[PDB]
Amino acid sequence: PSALTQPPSASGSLGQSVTISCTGTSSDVGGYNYVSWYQQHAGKAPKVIIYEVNKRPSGVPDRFSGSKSGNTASLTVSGLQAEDEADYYCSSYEGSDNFVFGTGTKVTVLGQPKANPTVTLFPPSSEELQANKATLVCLISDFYPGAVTVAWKADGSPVKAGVETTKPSKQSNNKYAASSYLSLTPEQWKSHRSYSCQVTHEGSTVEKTVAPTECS
Amino acid sequence: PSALTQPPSASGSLGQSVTISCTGTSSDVGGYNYVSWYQQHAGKAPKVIIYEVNKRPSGVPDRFSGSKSGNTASLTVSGLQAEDEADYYCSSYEGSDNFVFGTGTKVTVLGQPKANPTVTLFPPSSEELQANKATLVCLISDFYPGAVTVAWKADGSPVKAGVETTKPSKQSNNKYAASSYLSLTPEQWKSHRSYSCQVTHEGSTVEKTVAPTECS
């Protein structure tokens, strides 16, 4: 039949408001008061923000308001934090114990400050080496936005081969989290002095060097 | 919350029938029928394929099933077909003001051989500590299907409270790669006996454990 109409957006700004209408029909959003609103951050599990058009779980953000106007219903997200950058969904009872969901709205929160990456470079630890492999890891983290390049260096002459960068997941903030790795056999590991990892983000480059001299 | 756990990756083939489990934390379960299965596609809405334990709503083919014994609600795709590929969540009504989901499965149809992780844990670098900074990273490498569950522990006590996980990416070997971490301070690092990164990937569960045998 139909799947509730929702717009792919709600671009608010830090503090500023945003309200998300979701248009239903007679058959559902018309003749029943069973509208739920979900707050799904990318690939995660969905949570019950609004549960009966307006009314939230005792464990939801103080001002995440909602309503119904006849065939269209809404969510007054008014306390613009950024935690909530996500995909939101509506859902209405209709026929016999049947529930239909929305298209999805993709809320986006603007004028977030530029976060610039914390680069931490890792050397193979003993256990790894006991087995006679030696991988290295460049954890690129806590940044905004999420377009970054990670350039490994053998030493000068770039070791960008055997590399496996694995790009950026928003983390418990809405600040990113990328990784990249080098497979080294301990031989090459004990070959050529220093290695690098150079995370270039929005112009600001960061290069971290590990050398074989530590305490394992 | 996630007070109902699901197999991170659940998979078969065109023909392989696939059972997912939503196991309950709930000292409630049994005093319920209300387990509900929500299938999901890639940038599609959750789609409520099973209601209160047994009953499919219209257009949910009779070969999606629901069963629940003790704590574990269960669902069976009773003859996997291609676009059964999807993230399957489980709801439980719990009371009101509290409507909680499982963490989502992932029905993969295998078109590649299965690949159990290569969980390579790393310990806080010396120079890294040389700044008063202690971060552990648990590079999960080389899995298929691309879904995994990382836990972090210390001294027989789970540490839910310091971690980030990324989201499995496709490496040039069509094998997936994740990261994950526990960023802290030399105090919490130092004051402890062990630090196990645990990782689970359908069936196989591998725990790698580091120790605070630090230098300076």
């Binding site: 069973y34 739920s36 549960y51 009872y93 | 209300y34 709801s91 009504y93 409507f99």
Partner: peptide, 4 residues
């Protein structure tokens, strides 16, 4: 959803 739960409703009912």
């Amino acid at each position: 959803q739960x409703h009912x």
